[PDB]
Amino acid sequence: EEQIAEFKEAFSLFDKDGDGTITTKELGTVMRSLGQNPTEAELQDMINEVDADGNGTIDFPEFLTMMARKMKDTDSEEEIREAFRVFDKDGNGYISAAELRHVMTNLGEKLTDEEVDEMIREADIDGDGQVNYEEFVQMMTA
Amino acid sequence: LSEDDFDMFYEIWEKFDPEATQFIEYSVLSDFADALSEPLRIAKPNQISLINMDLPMVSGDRIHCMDILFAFTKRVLGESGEMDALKIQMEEKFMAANPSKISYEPITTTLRRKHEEVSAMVIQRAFRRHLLQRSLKHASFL
Amino acid sequence: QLKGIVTRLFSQQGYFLQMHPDGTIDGTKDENSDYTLFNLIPVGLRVVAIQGVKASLYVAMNGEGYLYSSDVFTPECKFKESVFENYYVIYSSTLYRQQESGRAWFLGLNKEGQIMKGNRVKKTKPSSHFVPKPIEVCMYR
Numbered sequence: 197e198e199q200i201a202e203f204k205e206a207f208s209l210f211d212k213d214g215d216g217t218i219t220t221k222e223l224g225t226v227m228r229s230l231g232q233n234p235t236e237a238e239l240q241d242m243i244n245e246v247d248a249d250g251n252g253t254i255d256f257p258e259f260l261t262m263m264a265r266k267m268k269d270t271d272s273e274e275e276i277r278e279a280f281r282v283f284d285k286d287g288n289g290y291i292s293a294a295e296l297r298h299v300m301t302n303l304g305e306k307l308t309d310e311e312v313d314e315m316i317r318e319a320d321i322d323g324d325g326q327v328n329y330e331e332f333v334q335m336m337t338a
Numbered sequence: 339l340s341e342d343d344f345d346m347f348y349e350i351w352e353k354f355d356p357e358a359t360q361f362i363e364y365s366v367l368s369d370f371a372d373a374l375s376e377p378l379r380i381a382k383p384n385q386i387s388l389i390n391m392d393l394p395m396v397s398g399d400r401i402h403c404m405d406i407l408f409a410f411t412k413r414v415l416g417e418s419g420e421m422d423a424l425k426i427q428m429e430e431k432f433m434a435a436n437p438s439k440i441s442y443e444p445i446t447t448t449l450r451r452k453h454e455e456v457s458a459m460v461i462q463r464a465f466r467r468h469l470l471q472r473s474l475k476h477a478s479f480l
Numbered sequence: 481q482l483k484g485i486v487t488r489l490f491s492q493q494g495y496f497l498q499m500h501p502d503g504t505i506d507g508t509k510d511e512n513s514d515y516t517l518f519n520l521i522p523v524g525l526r527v528v529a530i531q532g533v534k535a536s537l538y539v540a541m542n543g544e545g546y547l548y549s550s551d552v553f554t555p556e557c558k559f560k561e562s563v564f565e566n567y568y569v570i571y572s573s574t575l576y577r578q579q580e581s582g583r584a585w586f587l588g589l590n591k592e593g594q595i596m597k598g599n600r601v602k603k604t605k606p607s608s609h610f611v612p613k614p615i616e617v618c619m620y621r
């Protein structure tokens with residue numbers, strides 16, 4: 197499938213030295229490439245819970261397992277539309293970008309400023325300050 | 339409203355509380371709110387209706403019958419007036435009718451916050467998945 | 481006998497509620513003020529008693545609307561808890577109302593982390609609004 201090919205591509209973006217193995221350092225550079233700022237403790241955690249070998253590295257299968265845990269949808273039904281509706285105060289299909297930013301930064305598994313910024317650049321296409329959350333849901337589950 | 343609606347209420351309650359613990363989990367509330375008969379019933383999607391109702395939750399995330407009843411009824415009764423005095427009277431009646439004392443537990447948190455949190459977790463999760471997807475896309479070329 | 485909880489009360493005004501050993505009650509920015517921990521006991525249906533754990537002092541309310549500190553359990557230690565806009569928790573007095581208007585006297589703090597009088601705290605004002613950050617559930621006598 198195209199799936200495993202994308203996994204090969206990912207491993208390909210990851211291996212600078214091409215040793216077949218991902219290090220805590222490399223995890224670091226990647227997480228940072230996503231816009232996160234993990235601690236060494238957090239990385240050692242991210243490894244320890246997913247390491248089967250405990251080789252400090254991630255081979256293709258372990259990469260598969262981890263990406264599988266991340267990609268699987270748990271509370272996602274595409275009726276995440278409901279989740280947006282929870283915050284759509286007047287139900288007009290639009291949420292002001294400000295409110296969205298506040299909510300995302302102050303509630304739940306809060307997003308970083310980088311994450312929020314990108315999310316907002318993606319969600320407010322016309323930059324009018326109003327966000328058509330349904331189109332965002334379509335885009336998001338493409 | 340009539341006595342029939344209240345008897346019906348206790349009837350559904352015995353179904354949702356087969357042990358007469360005088361409490362239900364919030365996750366099921368929607369279902370229960372949809373399970374009733376008219377006019378007390380709140381058909382799905384009822385989530386907003388449930389979120390606008392003053393609905394206290396004890397630990398852990400459990401709600402008591404008196405609050406649910408009072409709210410569902412008050413939605414029909416509108417503001418009061420005599421219906422509030424009758425509300426207090428019927429509340430006392432329910433207290434007296436209730437066996438034991440252990441079911442008296444103090445308020446912890448409430449609805450909105452729970453559903454908002456779940457919503458946030460959902461959106462964050464999905465967003466993360468799409469970040470991953472985009473990164474792999476960056477990998478493919480080349 | 482009674483199934484209550486232990487918790488920290490965070491005022492929306494921006495402080496952790498603090499019952500100091502000397503009976504002085506205020507709002508603090510200190511996370512670990514052990515005077516900020518409290519015993520919530522359901523002394524009835526939506527009626528709760530609040531106790532400063534460090535001083536074992538009941539947060540009682542006398543005849544003037546002042547939240548003094550008390551050792552003995554008086555019915556003045558009774559508080560009618562209620563949610564505001566399904567988002568904030570408020571504890572009112574079972575004795576106090578604007579006896580004409582019926583507007584109850586609530587526990588409340590000003591913007592400076594200082595305690596307010598009962599009749600000056602409005603239900604709709606940020607003073608009366610509190611968020612319980614719980615620790616554990618406990619059984620009481």
Ligand SMILES: [Ca+2]
Nearest residue numbers: 215217218219
């Ligand atoms: Ca490597």
Ligand SMILES: [Ca+2]
Nearest residue numbers: 249251253255
């Ligand atoms: Ca390995």
Ligand SMILES: [Ca+2]
Nearest residue numbers: 285286290291
């Ligand atoms: Ca809106």
Ligand SMILES: [Ca+2]
Nearest residue numbers: 320323324326
């Ligand atoms: Ca827009």
